């Protein structure tokens, strides 16, 4: 199906502690593949997936060089925003940047993104047309006007439709064994009496990839959304994901309930029953 590449950058000022913290991470779909941490010893972009480890020194030196230039822009940006919002030097502030691209089944360009947040809220974002900006407040208009004058959107559009898509394709090819894989969920149900009158039925999905999944409960074929406890999809730590959905069943009504599992790895959606 579709694929994406995303880079996530976090910049946190540290009053009276010197340099701001800077962390960068890169993902292809739901698989992390690179990292940079200003606090680590290496001061280099590093691999976090086996299929990129052997990319070679020209690749690693290049990613290291560019990510250090990102770090320097963010160090200055923190001071610029402190000024735009007339903030004191005493407080810690966070800048976040995310950019990347989506490709379709045929792997050609579908969408590009480039967006920033200051202290957890939208600051500026490149619009879908990759030609215009959305400035979230008064301060952000100064950036919008500056970026409009310096033709920043044209430069970002070139990267998003070019390098981004080109390298996403390369990584999908190099990491085929694990990026182009689909691991269907291993599923099971558990039953525990809260009390003799009631029991919890919990429907599990384990060891799946990609993360996208739908887990629902029905009672006599009717959706039980309001009465389902559904946990956020969570990483197992080995590159797979987990999720569960639970309902409280009055004792003796187990047969009325069905759990429904939908995932890209399943040829047909699953219907599970406690029986």
């Amino acid at each position: 199906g579709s694929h994406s590449m995303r880079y996530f950058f976090t910049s946190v000022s540290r009053p009276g502690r010197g340099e701001p913290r800077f962390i960068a991470v890169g993902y292809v779909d739901d698989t992390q593949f690179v990292r940079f941490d200003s606090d680590a010893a290496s001061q280099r972009m590093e691999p976090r997936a086996p299929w990129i480890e052997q990319e070679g020194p020209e690749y690693w030196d290049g990613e290291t060089r560019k990510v250090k230039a990102h770090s320097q822009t963010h160090r200055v940006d923190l001071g610029t925003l402190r000024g735009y919002y007339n903030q004191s030097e005493a407080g810690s502030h966070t800048v976040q940047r995310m950019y990347g691209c989506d490709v379709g089944s045929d792997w050609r360009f579908l969408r590009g993104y480039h967006q920033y947040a200051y202290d957890g809220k939208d600051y500026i974002a490149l619009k879908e047309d990759l030609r215009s900006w959305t400035a979230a407040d008064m301060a952000a208009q100064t950036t919008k006007h500056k970026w409009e004058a310096a033709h920043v959107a044209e430069q970002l559009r070139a990267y998003l439709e070019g390098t981004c898509v080109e390298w996403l394709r390369r990584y999908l090819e190099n990491g085929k064994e694990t990026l182009q894989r689909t691991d269907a969920p291993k599923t099971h149900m558990t039953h525990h009496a809260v009390s003799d009158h009631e029991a919890t039925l919990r429907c599990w999905a384990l060891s799946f990839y990609p993360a996208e999944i739908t887990l629902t409960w029905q009672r006599d074929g009717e959706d039980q959304t309001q009465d389902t406890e559904l946990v956020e999809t969570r990483p197992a730590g080995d590159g797979t994901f987990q999720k569960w959905a639970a309902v409280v069943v009055p004792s003796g009504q187990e047969q009325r309930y069905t759990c429904h599992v939908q995932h890209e790895g399943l040829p047909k959606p699953l219907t599970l029953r406690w029986e």
Binding site: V12, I23, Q32, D119, G120, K121, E232, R234, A236, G237
Partner: protein
């Protein structure tokens, strides 16, 4: 300023089987700002060898991290995840339940 409370899940990588090696995870997500303290506990004591994932964030800008350690569950040993963040009046302790 925006402050979002961490969601916390404590769980094992595999299904728990007494006496079989595994990983204990504590997934913290949906929080802002990024400063967070996460400890894994064994019978109430802080586990020393605990690693964590690289700081990343969701579409809504909130952060997420996975803290993890190797462990071999037993019938009697109790595990937990203890989290501190600016949104919390005191650290939140979430006990590990092998079926959650």
């Amino acid at each position: 300023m925006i402050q979002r409370t961490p969601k916390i899940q404590v769980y094992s990588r595999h299904p728990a089987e007494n006496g079989k090696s595994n990983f204990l995870n504590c997934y913290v997500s949906g929080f802002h700002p990024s400063d967070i303290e996460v400890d894994l506990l064994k019978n109430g004591e802080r586990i020393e060898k605990v690693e964590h994932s690289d700081l990343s964030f969701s579409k809504d800008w909130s952060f997420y991290l996975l803290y993890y350690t190797e462990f071999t569950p037993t019938e009697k040993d109790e595990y937990a995840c203890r989290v501190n963040h600016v949104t919390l009046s005191q650290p939140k302790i979430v006990k590990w339940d092998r079926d959650m």
